[PDB]
Amino acid sequence: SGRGAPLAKVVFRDPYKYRLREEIFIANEGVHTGQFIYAGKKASLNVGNVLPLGSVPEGTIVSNVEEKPGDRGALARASGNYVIIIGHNPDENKTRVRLPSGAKKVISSDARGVIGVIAGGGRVDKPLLKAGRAFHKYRLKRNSWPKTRGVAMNPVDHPHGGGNHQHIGKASTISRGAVSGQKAGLIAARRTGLLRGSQKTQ
Amino acid sequence: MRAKWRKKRTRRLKRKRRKVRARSK
Amino acid sequence: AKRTKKVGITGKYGVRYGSSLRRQVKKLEIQQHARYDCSFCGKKTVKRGAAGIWTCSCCKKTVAGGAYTVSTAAAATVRSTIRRLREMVEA
Amino acid sequence: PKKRASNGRNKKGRGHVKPVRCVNCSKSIPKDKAIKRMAIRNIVEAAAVRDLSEASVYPEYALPKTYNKLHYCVSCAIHARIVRVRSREDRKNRAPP
Amino acid sequence: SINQKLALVIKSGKYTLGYKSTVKSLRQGKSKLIIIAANTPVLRKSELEYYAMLSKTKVYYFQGGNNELGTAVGKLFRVGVVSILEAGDSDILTTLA
Amino acid sequence: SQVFGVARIYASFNDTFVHVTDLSGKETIARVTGGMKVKADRDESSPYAAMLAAQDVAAKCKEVGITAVHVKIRATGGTRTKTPGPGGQAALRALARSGLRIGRIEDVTPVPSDSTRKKGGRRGRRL
Amino acid sequence: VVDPFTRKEWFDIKAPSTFENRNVGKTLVNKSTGLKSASDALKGRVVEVCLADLQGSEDHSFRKIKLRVDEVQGKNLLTNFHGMDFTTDKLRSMVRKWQTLIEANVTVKTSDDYVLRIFAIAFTRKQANQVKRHSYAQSSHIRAIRKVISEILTKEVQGSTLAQLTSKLIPEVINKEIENATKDIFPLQNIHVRKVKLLKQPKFDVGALMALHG
RNA sequence: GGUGAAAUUCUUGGAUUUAUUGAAGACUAACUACUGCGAAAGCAUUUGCCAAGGACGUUUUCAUUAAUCAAGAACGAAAGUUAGGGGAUCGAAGAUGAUCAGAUACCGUCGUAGUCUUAACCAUAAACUAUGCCGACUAGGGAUCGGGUGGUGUUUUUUUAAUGACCCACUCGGCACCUUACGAGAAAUCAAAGUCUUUGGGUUCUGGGGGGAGUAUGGUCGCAAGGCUGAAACUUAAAGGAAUUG
Ligand SMILES: [Mg+2]
Ligand SMILES: [Mg+2]
Ligand SMILES: [Mg+2]
Ligand SMILES: [Mg+2]
Ligand SMILES: [Mg+2]
Ligand SMILES: [Mg+2]
Ligand SMILES: [Mg+2]
Ligand SMILES: [Mg+2]
Ligand SMILES: [Mg+2]
Ligand SMILES: [Mg+2]
Ligand SMILES: [Mg+2]
Ligand SMILES: [Mg+2]
Ligand SMILES: [Mg+2]
Ligand SMILES: [Mg+2]
Ligand SMILES: [Mg+2]
Ligand SMILES: [Mg+2]
Ligand SMILES: [Mg+2]
Ligand SMILES: [Mg+2]
Ligand SMILES: [Mg+2]
Ligand SMILES: [Mg+2]
Ligand SMILES: [Mg+2]
Ligand SMILES: [Mg+2]
Ligand SMILES: [Mg+2]
Ligand SMILES: [Mg+2]
Ligand SMILES: [Mg+2]
Ligand SMILES: [Mg+2]
Ligand SMILES: [Zn+2]
Ligand SMILES: [Zn+2]
């Protein structure tokens, strides 16, 4: 609930005790019930397994990627996302990858990831098409909806408050050095206006 | 005037009078 | 007789929200409702619930999928290039 | 009326010939219709091909040249290169010389 | 292909479709060969393979799901396994398969 | 018989380029031919000026010491003229005549397999 | 004047074996300081020596050749193979109008665990009793011919060591081991291999490479 | 750097050049031609798979099953529209540097859309041979593509065949070209544009002086841009075609 991606409950034996341990994964697209999941350095390059970014060749597609070895997954977890691996510097044993944002971060080759892309992709291409569908969306995330335009408020409630007409009355772009109670609008915006032209990271 | 320019001329002309009486449509 | 010339399933929304929004909904609607074919048993018995969860009526098998189709283009073009990279590490 | 049964050039029975782009002005021109001339000129000049050979090693081993096919657009082909406008029955003669 | 050699013994010889009838075939020895759709589950597969081993029956794995192997034998339903009982005149019992 | 380099010549229309270096290529020794003793910037490709700065090119060539090299001469090419330029040959004229030694020669002009459509569009430059 | 001319010092190749001449000539890279000077920033170049430059007479004089700087020690510097090619002049002189070109390639391996892409190039000869001015094959030939060159390249590259390979195609008779098959298909003049190149190696294996010198 | 010449521009950021090397998307050079294939649009690296086709060959099979076609339907360059991906190149728009009296341009620069691909639209091009389809007949000539037949023809030599490529002759069906004109045409020219006042093989389609105008109107198709259908009032003695002389 409140998530786009489905989850995969994955059961393993306890190496140190007669016991089962049931982890909770994010389901990469194409995983299925009853499937077998292999985890570790000397594991195979099958969508669903979880291998250190050392063990995989550039161009691999992984999800739930760790920022540090063993933090149990940080990157590329929202439905339909992934990170690509774009090369290894084995001497320092790093691995350089490209995240969903486009930004390219380098991290240890011991950090782990899950071969594949996360499930439930395409969720956002469907319009919500009524206020109620959004209301029910956010019922289960948080009290963020609906949103009142700061410019419909009196000045006591907002920097954009008041006026005999509805206008921001001053630049909507706010300095990073601004103070809490000031930072509303386009914070630290390096640019503004309708983005024209190819936007894919050069 | 050129033939295809006379074409653009009246394609435009018609778009405009199409408009002008969708106003009373 | 044919019941609607263009709205299809999207007639439930009546006249509201504008043709463009309704049309683009209809597309994904048809996707997420239709029965698909099961890869493990070969009948068309896999239907959606809880988008990205696709389950086979008989044989009780479930598969993570796209939000409104079983396999999304991206996934499939990953599957392909994960095979490719795999076959390149035994020979 | 018509002025060539050839009207452009050297195309009967395909309907389309993907075009070439002219060497002088870059203007495209269907391949059948571009005038073609193969430019063979060597590495050499008139008075310059003696001494590059004198203060030299490999005592005139190879002497190669620059091979490149040329395509023009006819208007540019007309401007300088061989068009040299012919005259009604003289233009039907396809003898190169 | 092989689909044609099999599509001969449909019109020619004796067969049986279905997991149950073909394992009665396998334990009564009457099987010379059994063909197994791609998508048929590994447990069934290994079971048949065992029964085969004990009848000394050979097995071929049809590349193609049970849908394909059903349309292969001219039937309009899925078929998870086939079991030939007489290869009416197919050499399928003596081809490289 | 003696010590070798690489020639690395390049002809355009309105400029010319000539430069010695290691046969390995990595380390370059001197090039500047260009617009150097010409300056009206019409005359950048001119043969007179290609010669006038080819002289100061061969000069540093033997000023650090080498007797001989063969050419790698080339027009701009790409999707542009692909035919040699004016101050390509009038330089090695006055660099073979500069008493230096020359050998196995070849063109290195880039030529594609017919792509990366040229500038000017389907009507070309219009004059 | 900083006058770097005095600064640095030349170094030297010579060729490996499978040839007769080996003295390359000389290079200039940098003084060998240590804080970054040449141990590591060596063996990363190539050079362009013609072949009649390298073995003999000009029956052998069209092939370009790359040579990859492999490793260095005192007054060493030694360069193994990197590939090869033809030269613009002859290829532009062998492609005559009014005849058929035929070109093919394959990527195949040698015991020296180098994969590589060979090439080959062949043209049409006009039977020298013959009147028809264009001399064209009929694509029953083009497909069967490139089918047979492809039959043959692999069984010499998979045939043996990149070193023996060099020794196989230097004498060039591969060119007419092609004409062996072809004589039963088409006249097929001017049959050459016309390049060779790859990118991946087994990690250096220093001791293998000194086996070409003495 | 770029051009006729310049300038906008890029250069402590080592630019333009070199070397090694990697990514992305587009295209298929040279071979390429009076050469092939497809209903047309159109189609040029390799290989595998999938179905399809004309010509040929034929003492095989059926036996009039056919020709052409309002309505109706399949495909349909380029650009353009909807939703993803892609977005390297070149590049409507727009912004600029120059030229000019002016210069919204031509030349230069940046570069949005586009250019590429998937799912769906759109249905128009000087979509041209400005030349309906099936059939018959009328005239000479050498090239060439495909099939075929003929051989004490040449070459491969292996040891001569077998073959393969080649030469010569013939015959079907192609893409053309040449010379003539019986003949046709207003001519330019045309083996059809011929076999017409000596006017009739079958069949489909369009035009009836120029403008008005492919405009108005209605119907219909389309998301839109627009497609198909498509007048009249009035106005006018010419407008047009081919060729000759200037
Ligand atoms: Mg609230
Ligand atoms: Mg809001
Ligand atoms: Mg609001
Ligand atoms: Mg208020
Ligand atoms: Mg305030
Ligand atoms: Mg304020
Ligand atoms: Mg206010
Ligand atoms: Mg406001
Ligand atoms: Mg109104
Ligand atoms: Mg005219
Ligand atoms: Mg044409
Ligand atoms: Mg056309
Ligand atoms: Mg002009
Ligand atoms: Mg090609
Ligand atoms: Mg009707
Ligand atoms: Mg773009
Ligand atoms: Mg403008
Ligand atoms: Mg201005
Ligand atoms: Mg403007
Ligand atoms: Mg039309
Ligand atoms: Mg035409
Ligand atoms: Mg005709
Ligand atoms: Mg028409
Ligand atoms: Mg005739
Ligand atoms: Mg007459
Ligand atoms: Mg209308
Ligand atoms: Zn199932
Ligand atoms: Zn031109």
Distance between CA atoms of residues F108 and F72, nearest Å: 6
Q: Chain A contact for C41, CB < 8 A?
A: no
Task: Indicate which of G89, G93, G95 best probes the interface with D, i.e. most D CBs within 10 Å of its own CB.
Answer: G89
Q: Identify whether G103 is part of a domain.
A: yes
CB proximity F122–strand H (7 Å threshold): no
CA D3–ligand 24 middle distance (angstroms): 25
Return the number of other C-beta atoms located less than 10 Å from residue G74's C-beta: 5
Long-range pairs for C28-37: beta carbons < 8 A, 24 or more residues apart: C28/A122, C28/A125, C28/A126, C28/C68, C31/C68, C31/C69, C32/C67, C32/C68, C32/C69, C33/C9, C36/C69, C36/C70
Quick check: F106 and G89 CB within 8 A? yes
Q: Identify whether G1 is part of a domain.
A: no
Chains interfacing with C (3 or more CB pairs < 8 Å)? A, E
Query: Nearest Cβ partner of D26 from F100, F105, F124?
Result: F124
How many domains, in total, are found in chain E? 1
Identify residue A112 by its one-letter amino acid code: R
The phi and psi torsions of D92 (rounded to 5 degrees) equal -75, -15
The phi and psi torsions of D34 (rounded to 5 degrees) equal -70, 135
Quick check: A57 and C17 CB within 8 A? no
Alpha-helical regions (H) of A26-122: none
Contact (Cβ atoms closer than 8 angstroms) between residue A96 and residue A54: no
Distance between CA atoms of residues A193 and A191, nearest Å: 7
- Within a 13 Å sphere around the CA of G177, how many CA atoms are in the beta-carbon half? 16
Alpha-helical regions (H) of chain A: 131-139
Q: Which domain holds residue G130?
A: 6-214
CATH number of the domain that residue E23 is part of: 3.30.1330.30
Strand H nucleotides below 7 A of a protein CB? 1-7, 15-22, 25-38, 40-48, 83-84, 86-92, 106-109, 111-113, 129-130, 143-147, 153-156, 163-168, 175-178, 187-190, 213-217, 225-226, 241-243
What are E17's strand-pairing partners?
E82
With an 8 Å Cβ cutoff, the interface of chain E facing chain C consists of: 37, 39, 41, 65-67, 78
DSSP E strands in F1-127: the ranges are 9-11, 16-18, 20-21, 28-30, 74-75
Taking alpha carbons only, the member of D30, D23, D28, D39 closest to residue D72 is D23
Distance between CA atoms of residues E14 and E19, nearest Å: 16
Q: Which two tokens stand for residue D92?
A: 């039907």
Quick check: F64 and G5 CB within 8 A? yes
Q: Which domain holds residue E53?
A: 1-97
Non-local CB neighbours of G147 within 8 Å, separated by 6+ positions: none
Quick check: F93 and D55 CB within 8 A? no
Alpha carbon separation from E82 to D70, E46, E64 (Å, rounded): 67, 15, 13
Pairing of the two strands E33-37 and E58-62:
parallel
Quick check: C42 and E65 CB within 8 A? yes
Non-local CB neighbours of E6 within 8 Å, separated by 6+ positions: E35, E72, E73, E82, E90, E92
Q: Mapping DSSP to helix (H, G, I), strand (E, B) and coil, where does residue G154 land? A: helix
Q: What is the resolution of this structure in A?
A: 2.9
Alpha-helical regions (H) of G25-161: 51-54, 88-94, 140-157
Alpha carbon separation from D97 to A89, C82, D93, F54, F118 (Å, rounded): 65, 62, 11, 39, 32
Non-local CB neighbours of E51 within 8 Å, separated by 6+ positions: E23, E26, E27, E57
Nucleotide with minimal C1' distance from the CA of D3 is: H188
Q: Which two tokens stand for residue A7?
A: 């989850």
Method: X-ray
Distance between CA atoms of residues A182 and A180, nearest Å: 5
How many domains, in total, are found in chain G? 1
Q: Return the H-helix or E-strand segment holding E67.
A: helix E66-72
Distance between CA atoms of residues F121 and A72, nearest Å: 56
Q: Chain A contact for C57, CB < 8 A?
A: no
